[PDB]
Design a binder for these strands. Structure first.
Length: 188
RNA sequence: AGAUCAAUGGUCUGAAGCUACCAUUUGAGAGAUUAUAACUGAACGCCUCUAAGUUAGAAUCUCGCCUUGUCAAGGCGAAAAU
């Protein structure tokens, strides 16, 4: 069944603008600007008023209609990124071996050492627009921060999956660095 | 003394050439991705690696390096003398 019309709207708080057209959005706020392309979906996106963006679909099937809220949530994430940003805190857990985490290449690469005592050095590059920092106060804590949630979470996932155990049971060899918290930069 | 014959008379040494893991030398990179693990995220106001979109990804696959390249829209250039 092809529903005649189905739409959703996103409302923008004060201080941020979107200026959408041709299915590419250009959200801008205090923390810069994020541009996202949504041309893989054949919906109609337009400005209705001053701070409302409407995403609409004519004659869509279940699978196409499922994407309206997806796009709206993506735009909401852009708003959050430009207002308060994104910050992922990850904790290192080990039984015996301290996981030594450092930054090199102009603070653009994360190096993991001593993970389970292996002499190999694990190198993870950081996506553009994302930064990293070790906590000097809270030990064993690494923070990856940025505007774009997609890239921030991709960097966090890269770091988390970089540390994996092999040939030993993960039910009790729990060593590794895990994403413990997902929050915003500005205290909410 | 010099040699010849015995279908290579026989024994010892034997260069040269050929030749032995029986001697010596040389053998390696990317790209898209599978299984899989994940990101964001609906459907299904919650969840979810999946539906749209994203990551990492291999003795596999494609290419690179390497061999041929008298190739019928007679495969295609440069340049010399005619």
């Amino acid at each position: 069944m092809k529903l005649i019309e189905s739409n959703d709207t996103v409302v923008f708080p004060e201080g941020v603008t979107f200026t959408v057209k041709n299915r590419i959005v250009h959200v801008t706020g205090p923390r810069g600007t994020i541009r996202k392309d949504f041309r893989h979906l054949h919906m109609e996106m337009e400005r209705i008023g001053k701070s409302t963006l409407r995403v609409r679909k004519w004659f869509g099937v279940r699978k196409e209609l499922a994407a309206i809220r997806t796009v709206c949530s993506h735009i909401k994430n852009m708003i959050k990124g430009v207002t308060v940003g994104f910050r992922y805190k990850m904790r290192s857990v080990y039984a015996h071996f301290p996981i030594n985490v450092t930054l090199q290449d102009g603070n653009r690469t994360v190096e993991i050492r001593n993970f389970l005592g292996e002499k190999i050095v694990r190198r993870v590059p950081l996506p553009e627009g994302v930064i990293a920092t070790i906590s000097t106060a809270q030990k064993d804590e690494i923070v990856v921060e940025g505007n774009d949630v997609q890239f921030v979470s991709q960097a966090a996932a890269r770091i988390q999956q970089s540390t994996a155990v092999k040939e030993k049971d993960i039910r009790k060899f729990l060593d590794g660095i895990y994403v413990s918290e997902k929050t915003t930069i500005v205290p909410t």
